[model samples]
Target chain A: IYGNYLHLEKVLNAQELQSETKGNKIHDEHLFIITHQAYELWFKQILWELDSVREIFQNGHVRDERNMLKVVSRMHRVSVILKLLVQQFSILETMTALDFNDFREYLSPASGFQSLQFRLLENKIGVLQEENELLLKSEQEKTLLELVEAWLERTPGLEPHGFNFWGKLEKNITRGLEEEFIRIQAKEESEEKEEQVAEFQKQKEVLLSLFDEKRHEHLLSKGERRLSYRALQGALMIYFYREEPRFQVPFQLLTSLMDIDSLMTKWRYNHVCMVHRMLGSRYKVFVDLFNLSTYLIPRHWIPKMN
Target chain B: IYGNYLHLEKVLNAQELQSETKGNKIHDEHLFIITHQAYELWFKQILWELDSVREIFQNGHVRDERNMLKVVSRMHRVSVILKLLVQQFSILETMTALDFNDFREYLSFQSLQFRLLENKIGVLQNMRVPYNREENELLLKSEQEKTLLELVEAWLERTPGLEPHGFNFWGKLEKNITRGLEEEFIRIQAKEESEEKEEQVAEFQKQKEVLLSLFDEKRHEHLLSKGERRLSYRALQGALMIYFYREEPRFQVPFQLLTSLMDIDSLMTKWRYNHVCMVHRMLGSKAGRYKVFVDLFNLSTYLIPRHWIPKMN
Candidate 1:
């Protein structure tokens, strides 16, 4: 409608395409849309190197050290994605809590609670792999997994609400092999033993249907829908302030110039609270569960020292 | 398996973790596993709130903050994690190309990608929120979004291998929203029409199954998985860096550091090529990516940049 170059219509009419339409949302949707678009793009891009990064990271390529850096640089691009994710969250925060609540529940339990690919990327960054058989065993790991299992248990019979299961599912399934298998296997109960054979056929039909819906939705939206980009940015800005000074970056001192350390805990507090907000101190069966030595040493044993 | 209660398993039995366990394999796995595990544990322990470290951070809640720092104080715990995530990459680097390729196919595209979360924490800290969007609508307006978009495009462009259709769809989506929407909508409508052909009860039954599986297959994993604890030090390290640096931290330091170091490395790489050029009198191929190596030599990029840089001499 704004541009008569072609006729504008509902699916088409609502889209404000002018590049200048940059920050043009009636209510933070512009930042929302752009951030969403940015994420979809990054997802596609990261897929390209996910294998490369993991493979390189696992085996340690000598020639690929530069390749690793190349991969790292590509990986760094995600940092910008993180920046956008957090900033957009602040914008979202600007919206009334009521406004968010309106759409929030529609998100159901479908929070970023499940972003599996994200978890995979966490492993690549040399972070978040669970090997705590020694400590609490898989008790904490199992607890988190159970919470997810419970949520998933709740999700299927429900409507196609606004939650982000696709993103979260992809992330969780991909991170740890055992974790993924356990999650997928837990669903076996949905089918009846009498109809195990029939149920799978029915299950297959359902899966195909869902796949079709996702595909159709993806095509219609060109896969640009995102829920937490802005919130992510807001959360991350706090992390950056705290992280930059210590990681041994090229300009470690520059961090002091900005007083980033001063503002960091505010975000961490917020994030920790947010984690609580999402799960409410929910326990889980994660290898990295709260009670594990890995987790406890930091909280209890370490403190016992001084 | 060796420990009574718990002994950092990373280095403890790293050998059994890796396959075809050998002298170096066990040692290597120990190196890799301990490095990553220790890092996450340390990162988890670090006091996340400044209320405990307020004195150090100059916040009035110094005791609260100080009380919190104790949460993650085991240096040995942290050291193991740091050594695991960082220096060990070089150890992995020792594998031959064929060594990597042999097991490469076994590697699936699956990962938790937790670093996405970790890095975002860094990004979150450096975020420059537009307090009022209508006010800074011009300069700062969409500034953050565009920075992210451009950076994403550059990242996607560099990665080369995922299904190109998705990549193209993403770009097509970005360039113009109309065409993007049309493609997406048409796909959706076609799917809906197909679903409609089935009976209503059949449709409902079919849908419930689909919803359940999607949640199980995809949603459940993310929702169910426990949050991986990053190296407690990274979090604490991140915490300390931002706290001490008494300035409004922007994304500039890390970005600029990466930018300059890579550049100088490119330049110095060029110098190496030039040395080769001197030996042979003419270099072949695209000579250097390290011409920008000047940035690396400059330690200002290496450490947290303080006001003391120019005066330090």
Candidate 2:
């Protein structure tokens, strides 16, 4: 509630609304400015939490049970902040007249400002304005998928001679497959035996492919598999070990990472759809723009030097 | 003298009686001593942050991209502290250049800690003239391991997204260079003038020479050995890639990390610059003006100059 080094001289000073300064100081736009400004401040604090958390991980402090609680606490705080921001959009929705093409000669409009803001919130198709450089700015950084995938690629039980989770599972699964055939075969000439045998036959090649490295690469090149083969093995290993206390926190981490991903993607999707509803064109598919390099530029053409 | 956490008990008490014990104690020298005290405190804080950050990199947790957020953040805090320290000089300059020399007779403050700081900062020792090595040995009871600069050098050298077996940015750069360069030569070759062609050819050769010096491994090695450059060969290669496409998804934070490193480098340079400025404002015993990351200035070569800029063909 009270503080020092708060730098209140800089903070708590600047919130001049664009709509206000230009001519028509619409009251609703004042709310709009405050809303976005609050969003900005929260974003700054989230970065602070993110930065501090990364330090804990970087310094390997999170391994301590005490710091583990602190890490989870900060992450949970970020999750809550994002929730608040998403809820914040609807607050601005009450100012519907904020966007009405007000003057007839200037492509003017009618009706209520709050009503207009309400309609805009209902649209929920596009919220990004000033082309949202902030989101795109973060967008350029390694995604949560990219970050967690790298982290998961080397889980504890992955070493081949030690525990060898993938190898052991393959061995057991193959033995189980054979056991299935042997048990079913013992069930002699029933009408169901042929169907059961055919079902086992159907899974055999697919299971073989799963164990092979080359098939994974083929699927990777075809965009069917997102993880590298080793990473896929590691991911399966983590889940297979999830019940153990050893992986309990590790599971919690991955679970937390997924929640972060969820909130952001929903925000991203909301922004994207909002852009479409407001702008409404083929070009309105905002995120596809980020993916343009994959589709538009041949990999060979992308410069190595640059 | 203070409220809240200023902790004035020790701070105000410690402007000791060294000058007071002398035949004549100059009043303004109190401020003279105080400024350096402030300087030393900040330096100590900087060392604290630096050691922790280097620990993270030393432990090799930075390999995870997620972990980089902390590295950059902590590094940024140090950068901020250095800038604030840079401005601290202006406050000391408020003391007239006089009174200190009278007090300078009363005491000799040794800056072994600062010299030790230079050691921890990764100033290449050979280039850093012969230190009073025997005294430093007794103190570290030991010291001299990896520095933040060298650690950073190692980290940047492994900058991801440059794998030859992967997207092969280096290989891509080679094609683009050869291709981009040849494209330029033809454009210059197409120019019309009796005098123009030879000059253009000369400039083109000069441009190629510049490019070779930059892109060639042996040349960078030569520069490194001579202490004309700081970053490793591959690391320097990766740096330009970040500069060129810093806007890309993978490279953005990495780009920011580089800028933060640059911030740290430049701010230290300012510290050198300010320290020297302060000495000149007063007087000097050790005054030849040395700094690190000077090679960063040469990156102007990588960022091409303007004059009939090439449009993509």
Candidate 3:
């Protein structure tokens, strides 16, 4: 029955209530204290799950199909927890503006902007710090994205001289477009024909970029692309042949990866919205828009192969 | 610009770090400090919005169709904030299990603001998971906050077309549904006997039961008392009318109101489930000691179809 096992004494007594300490105790301060503590506890749980998932990837276990399930499950769990974190703000919103104002003066200088764990979590998930650096200087971190890209880069059948999936894909796309262009050119010369030709040309450029490894590498170096050219090919292949048994888990993993990214973006949008509400109109409007690579990398360019 | 206006000096210096002060500075203690601060700040904003929204409803303003937009917008904003609060937990979850253990004991205070908000929003007393029962009862007894649920319920009961004589939406709905049922029964009975016909009879019977339950005012009252229903029988009819006639200019805003209400209900239930799950994950089997809190949070799993808002017969 001793409180020592849970360290209840130290942890429970840890609240150095600023208002209470200054002999002007505000009623909402206790909630202000407890809610944050609850958040840290959950943050700890997430990091635990994250590191374990990261370990699986670091050990190259993702190459095994069975291990993909574990990876997918863990990543999905992280997303769900993230969703929970976003909802936790509503509970805190119960404290009135005046109630917050009461303790706001006493608790100056303490801002969530300084949370170290938040920064670490971002880096762990492959969001490189953008403070000051050349594009390539921050390019080589061994974060989750880097590890996933490496795994995708080695996907079987991607070898140029061997199965040569990319080469085969390029030939198919070029032939398909040529046939379509021929059909358009055969049409009566009018505004519609010219418009169709122009549209086809735009589609051609997009397809050309998909097969261009050099362009991909350039984008990679510029931090515009997270996956290597070969990995991009493998991702497209997985999307195309997702019904295959081996590719299903990999496909799910990729979808979950996108889910994680979008959820994080949603979180940022919600965070910015919450901040805007709090700071009034004086603050400049800022939004962090993620370039969803998943959309661009799939749906449009994967060559329809037999 | 100076950091003084943002109160960065006082706020930054606020984390006294019990573990750090005792010469065992836990790395996560700082995060523990910052996370709470962010939560408190958000809580302040939520209360600000909620009270404003409540004021609109408390006045006779919501009856004016134009004022419906203001009410819906604020309620929708609250829902969005609640969603953000739910996701905010993940940022906190990045801390390791052992790291949380380092400062777990310091977090025993149940959030009064959270309780206050819940009461004001109309969380039922019986529906509440009892933890520190005496203290909870004592705190709630002092101030009878006008719950959002009660206000919404009363407002809904006054829906323009719900009267039996003028516009008479409930009577109209009753006739329409009864006629619909008779038509359905005729279709089923006219078909020749076969396995498919037998299946149709069972399906028809199920729908009949649903309609029966919906039409019986006494049963609706019974369900309401048992916490199975949130709105009164007449208010329920008003909700149905808005659903069926949502395309009409007047009912359009009310329709959106119904959708937003369900959204808020579902999100709140999700928040409770996530909170309980996080606690169980952190405390593991050790969470059994907090049975009072566990039972209270677990009440969210009841899965009452209240959110579905029983569609028109």
Candidate 4:
């Protein structure tokens, strides 16, 4: 009864080893089949999560704070799955190089390149970088990154009449810097004072570059940055005040997004490493978010909170 | 041809969701099926690695250094797979608690493969209080004479260069340690009395007592009997030796093997805690937790600060 419910007859018997097809069965070939089979199963599951999550975001349900849990949990799950995919390659490494060589010929012309679900998973994530029916249509759909960028633009604190976080931040930074320059000038002539006087100049330049919207658009045109000017502002504000009551889940959500990117990066790293141990390879999706670390000014620069 | 090779006909079509079979197909049921199927596949591979590694150890092939690579690599693979499995639970957690209850009645608890795996991995039989009668009955099986943990303990005991009459590493260690402590005692005594000299001298005696307790075989045996130390007196010494000289060529893979064993123990505890957390999240549980590899975990008491390790060729 259990076996029937699970379709064990199909799954347990699905592995048709290449070496076994010709009458000479190799032990290592079974691992190769099962490993790839296992990967495909996971790919299917990831697509399931991806489709569910994309719908929630695309449907505009992510605006509610309660909905962030589902979005965050599902995104985190994909990151974990990607982590597992990276490590799964090591299991295949357990087969000796020579053993892999024995069955390597049987796998000719067949590559991981051919997995339809993998292509779909990438396409669904907005990679578009596959198919019969669903793949071709996916090329025209809004990607996850596109939807997230739009949502970030809508962050609550950004309105001009509202908290206008970016507006106040610029004023505070100028006030804070003008006060600091006078302090540096009053200090006795010394190496420490000399070094940081120019350091303050550099900090103002970096802040000036960020505040210029045209500079952001230029980088956006060149693909150096992914988010819009407004979205990048939203992202940094979320990062700075991540502990805020409303922004906490959004902060966790952003962290999970980066985790997905890092985990995918590792998946490719291990994929190449596994191949080298047997035979012998990301620019970030959230570039603004990744580069947000450098924009942090000294704590003294942000005016005291009342 | 590609789909045929991967048996996409079978694998891609294997989702026989009960919700779909009944009437209206709940979308979450698809994930439920695929997730369990994915786990079952990984569990199969994990069992594969365990079987091969156990066979290698059982056949005495592990005595050869070349064979040790396969053992360590395979065990490391299992640890990574286990890490994946533990993380995979987080994926299942994406499904809301209420969503799980909607389709809950159609499926029975299938605690089948993992229970057998835990048993096979040398978890003591009585360690589990079965959650259900059918699963409890499922736990009944022929026991192995030596478990993976037992086999590892015996292997650690047979560690090379640790023989009493030969290199006498354990004996050499005590004298070397004694002199090292004496040097520290002398250095501390040389310090000014106007300072915290009494505290420094007091710490020397504390270090001395800890070192003596570490070297005492009867004390090790006492802990061993009380379950505080899971390794035998000799095996504990072998583990410490392996830890100290992991940079040595011969001990490197063995040390990796040891580290992987502890990692396996640690990750499983994490897996169990996650399981308990998720189960309770779905349906709150009776309070409890358990552990393995107590000796390896308890070995930290004997560890010293990094500066004390003497230089070796």
Candidate 4 Cα outliers beyond 4 Å, as residue runs: A110-112, A128-130, A189-191, A194-202, A281-283, A298-306, B1-313
Which portions of model 3 miss their true places by more than 4 Å?
A1-306, B1-6, B107-109, B129-143, B289-313
User: TM-score for every candidate vs. truth?
Assistant: 0.21, 0.46, 0.48, 0.49
Model 3: per-residue lDDT, tens digit, B161-265? 777677776666566666777877898898789656666677567666666556688987886676666777776666666655566778788777766666676
For model 1, give the interface RMSD.
30.6
DockQ of each: 0.01, 0.01, 0.01, 0.01
Which runs of model 2 end up more than 4 angstroms from their true locations?
A1-306, B1-7, B126-143, B194-203, B284-291, B304-313
Instruction: After the best TM-score superposition of candidate 4, give how far the Cα of residue A67 lies from its true spot, in angstroms.
Output: 1.8
**Poorest lDDT segment (10 consecutive residues) of candidate 1 chain A:** A297-306
lDDT of 4: 0.73
B297: Cα error in model 3, Å:
20
The Cα local distance difference test for each model comes to 0.31, 0.58, 0.64, 0.73
Number of clashing pairs per prediction, in order: 132, 17, 45, 0
Task: Give the better candidate number (1 or 2) by lDDT.
Answer: 2
> What's candidate 1's DockQ score?
0.01
Taking the tens digit of each residue's C-alpha lDDT, what string does model 3 give over A22-119?
A: 99998898887886787677667776777787788889867776677788888888878777878788777666443565676565433433444545
Clashing pairs for predicted structure model 4, backbone only? none
- lDDT (10s digit) by residue, model 1, range B1-313: 5564567454455434443432233234344444445544544442122112222223222123332233123222333343344444444444322233222222111112222212211122232211221434433332333222123223223322123363332233223333333443454455455333343334234434432232132343443232221112122222222222313333223333233323323332333333342212111111111121221222121221122112110
RMSD of each: 29.5, 35.5, 28.1, 22.8
Q: Report residue A257 deviation for candidate 2 (angstroms).
A: 61
